[PDB]
Write an enzyme that holds these catalytic residues in place. Structure first.
Site, PDB file in Angstrom:
ATOM      1  N   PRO A  53     -24.225  23.268  33.773  1.00 47.23           N
ATOM      2  CA  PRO A  53     -24.883  23.156  32.464  1.00 47.23           C
ATOM      3  C   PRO A  53     -24.195  23.934  31.339  1.00 47.23           C
ATOM      4  O   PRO A  53     -24.012  23.383  30.252  1.00 47.23           O
ATOM      5  CB  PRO A  53     -26.283  23.707  32.736  1.00 47.23           C
ATOM      6  CG  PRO A  53     -26.512  23.390  34.195  1.00 47.23           C
ATOM      7  CD  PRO A  53     -25.175  23.606  34.844  1.00 47.23           C
ATOM      8  N   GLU A  54     -23.789  25.169  31.605  1.00 48.06           N
ATOM      9  CA  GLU A  54     -23.237  26.018  30.557  1.00 48.06           C
ATOM     10  C   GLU A  54     -21.950  25.427  30.000  1.00 48.06           C
ATOM     11  O   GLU A  54     -21.698  25.449  28.794  1.00 48.06           O
ATOM     12  CB  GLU A  54     -22.974  27.422  31.105  1.00 48.06           C
ATOM     13  CG  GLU A  54     -24.217  28.277  31.253  1.00 48.06           C
ATOM     14  CD  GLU A  54     -25.076  27.911  32.463  1.00 48.06           C
ATOM     15  OE1 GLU A  54     -24.636  27.116  33.327  1.00 48.06           O
ATOM     16  OE2 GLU A  54     -26.210  28.433  32.556  1.00 48.06           O
ATOM     17  N   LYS A  63     -16.794  11.594  30.758  1.00 47.21           N
ATOM     18  CA  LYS A  63     -17.286  11.696  32.130  1.00 47.21           C
ATOM     19  C   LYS A  63     -17.748  13.125  32.427  1.00 47.21           C
ATOM     20  O   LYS A  63     -17.368  13.695  33.451  1.00 47.21           O
ATOM     21  CB  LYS A  63     -16.157  11.329  33.115  1.00 47.21           C
ATOM     22  CG  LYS A  63     -15.563   9.929  32.952  1.00 47.21           C
ATOM     23  CD  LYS A  63     -16.460   8.874  33.561  1.00 47.21           C
ATOM     24  CE  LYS A  63     -15.832   7.489  33.580  1.00 47.21           C
ATOM     25  NZ  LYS A  63     -15.102   7.146  32.331  1.00 47.21           N
ATOM     26  N   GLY A 109     -14.250  -8.188  36.316  1.00 45.58           N
ATOM     27  CA  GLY A 109     -15.533  -8.557  35.746  1.00 45.58           C
ATOM     28  C   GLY A 109     -15.464  -9.676  34.720  1.00 45.58           C
ATOM     29  O   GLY A 109     -14.496  -9.790  33.962  1.00 45.58           O
TER      30      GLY A 109
HETATM   31  O1  LIG Z   1     -17.164   2.768  36.196  1.00 45.21           O
HETATM   32  C1  LIG Z   1     -16.415   2.889  35.222  1.00 45.21           C
HETATM   33  C2  LIG Z   1     -16.686   3.783  34.162  1.00 45.21           C
HETATM   34  C3  LIG Z   1     -15.785   3.837  33.125  1.00 45.21           C
HETATM   35  O2  LIG Z   1     -16.027   4.651  32.093  1.00 45.21           O
HETATM   36  N1  LIG Z   1     -14.650   3.073  33.125  1.00 45.21           N
HETATM   37  C4  LIG Z   1     -13.715   3.154  31.987  1.00 45.21           C
HETATM   38  O3  LIG Z   1     -13.766   1.917  31.244  1.00 45.21           O
HETATM   39  C5  LIG Z   1     -12.433   1.503  30.862  1.00 45.21           C
HETATM   40  C6  LIG Z   1     -12.025   0.220  31.601  1.00 45.21           C
HETATM   41  O4  LIG Z   1     -10.805  -0.165  30.995  1.00 45.21           O
HETATM   42  P1  LIG Z   1     -10.152  -1.520  31.557  1.00 45.21           P
HETATM   43  O5  LIG Z   1     -10.871  -2.724  30.797  1.00 45.21           O
HETATM   44  O6  LIG Z   1      -8.624  -1.366  31.108  1.00 45.21           O
HETATM   45  O7  LIG Z   1     -10.352  -1.649  33.019  1.00 45.21           O
HETATM   46  C7  LIG Z   1     -11.519   2.708  31.161  1.00 45.21           C
HETATM   47  O8  LIG Z   1     -11.482   3.571  30.011  1.00 45.21           O
HETATM   48  C8  LIG Z   1     -12.225   3.410  32.347  1.00 45.21           C
HETATM   49  O9  LIG Z   1     -11.931   4.812  32.356  1.00 45.21           O
HETATM   50  C9  LIG Z   1     -14.420   2.209  34.144  1.00 45.21           C
HETATM   51  O10 LIG Z   1     -13.427   1.482  34.176  1.00 45.21           O
HETATM   52  N2  LIG Z   1     -15.292   2.144  35.179  1.00 45.21           N
END
Ligand SMILES: O=c1cc(O)n([C@@H]2O[C@H](COP(=O)(O)O)[C@@H](O)[C@H]2O)c(=O)[nH]1
Ligand SMILES: O=c1cc(O)n([C@@H]2O[C@H](COP(=O)(O)O)[C@@H](O)[C@H]2O)c(=O)[nH]1
Lengths: 218, 218
Positions: free
Chosen positions: B69-70, B64, B179
């Site tokens: 930038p640096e 993330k 989801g």
């Molecule tokens: O919008 C985002 C962006 C992510 O990187 N993530 C990452 O994706 C993963 C989701 O894991 P999980 O299936 O246990 O919810 C975690 O590593 C979380 O940091 C997320 O859940 N939502």
């Protein structure tokens, strides 16, 4: 609030253990608070925090700009505090739940969250600047007591101080290399964060002493 | 990028033994692992090389990235030095911050993924309103890899519309956050799955089940 010696925080972003230790040791008499970020941690490991604590009488602020979902933020904070960080810096733009996640771990674990409301680099103008006032107010509503704001936009740093009030603690990067002035910044910030000006100097100790001389009356 | 079974494992366990065991348990189903700060800050960056040695999987470093930038440049360099094939970067801090990452990725033969929008409830506060503009910024910068939210398929669809069918899109928020695998794959090239697999009584069966549910999309 933390008592930051000389109102000066070292941003130790060297990526080599030997160099990081040398430079930090050289300026130890001027600074008791060190910001350690991912450049150093990803190069040398979280044990670098334990080494700085062992070697120096310094508080550690983990500049991790935590910016994930609440569940992941919790894990990041737990790992960071477990390693010996006194405080962690968290982004506000992912929203209130993500910040609260960090606040809850910090409360449980006896440590501190700093909220980054606005940034010092040109790109901050694109999206962050427009959200900054609301992110700061969200911080106040969540009970955040420590904040990070930019030395490179004094007008905006001043507004941030207004929003969070005089009791809140505010530290500010962008001094030196990015063009920020120590004195002008300390009109609003409790402490300045300085990295390259100091750690790339031929004589880091003289660089720190010089910054401090320039703000002696403050 | 060719992701086996359109399924990326989010390995956010924070113990080396468990992380390696569980990944081994599902190795037959995946060839791409997303490693984030929960594992890295608990076990060190050397874990990335360990995964390559044990599984040969590709590794996406979900850091993330969200600094100036640096500092972003330094973070990417440390990350790719550790053997990551790709890194995930926030778009919110602006174009210069993303370009810094693109620069290092090009230099070391790696990929940048742009996180345009997030899956958690807090994403609504600030991120959602900037999301389309961040996606367009990605297109302008020549970004080819994107991350968007399973938890909001209409917004995931819009992101796909913006970036085009040629761009690569991966999507977290599947399972634990609500989801649906199949619906998500209407728009994303691959789904990211963490807890539904790594907290499962039987992780292998968990992965097998998910794949079964999308078998006509393989
Ligand atoms: O919008 C985002 C962006 C992510 O990187 N993530 C990452 O994706 C993963 C989701 O894991 P999980 O299936 O246990 O919810 C975690 O590593 C979380 O940091 C997320 O859940 N939502
Ligand atoms: O808005 C911000 C927030 C930061 O944390 N920083 C951090 O503060 C430090 C600034 O270092 P320097 O004095 O070399 O410019 C870096 O560690 C950077 O990652 C910043 O520059 N601007």
């Amino acid at each position: 609030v933390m008592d930051v010696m000389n109102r000066l925080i070292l941003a130790m972003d060297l990526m080599n253990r030997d160099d990081a230790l040398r430079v930090t040791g050289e300026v130890r008499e001027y600074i008791d608070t060190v910001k350690i970020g991912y450049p150093l941690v990803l190069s040398e490991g979280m044990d670098i925090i334990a080494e700085f604590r062992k070697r120096f009488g310094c508080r550690i602020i983990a500049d991790f700009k935590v910016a994930d979902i609440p569940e992941t933020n919790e894990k990041i904070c737990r790992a960071t505090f477990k390693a010996g960080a006194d405080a962690i810096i968290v982004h506000g733009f992912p929203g209130a739940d993500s910040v609260r996640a960090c606040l809850n771990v910090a409360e449980e674990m006896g440590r501190e969250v700093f909220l980054l409301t606005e940034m010092s680099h040109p790109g901050a103008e694109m999206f962050i600047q427009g959200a900054a006032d609301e992110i700061a107010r969200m911080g106040v509503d969540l009970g955040v007591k420590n904040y990070v704001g930019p030395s490179t936009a004094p007008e905006r740093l001043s507004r941030l101080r207004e929003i969070i009030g005089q009791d809140s603690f505010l530290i500010s990067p962008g001094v030196g290399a990015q063009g920020g002035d120590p004195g002008e910044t300390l009109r609003f910030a409790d402490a300045i964060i300085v990295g390259r000006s100091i750690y790339l100097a031929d004589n880091p100790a003289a660089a720190a002493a010089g910054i401090i001389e320039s703000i002696k009356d403050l």
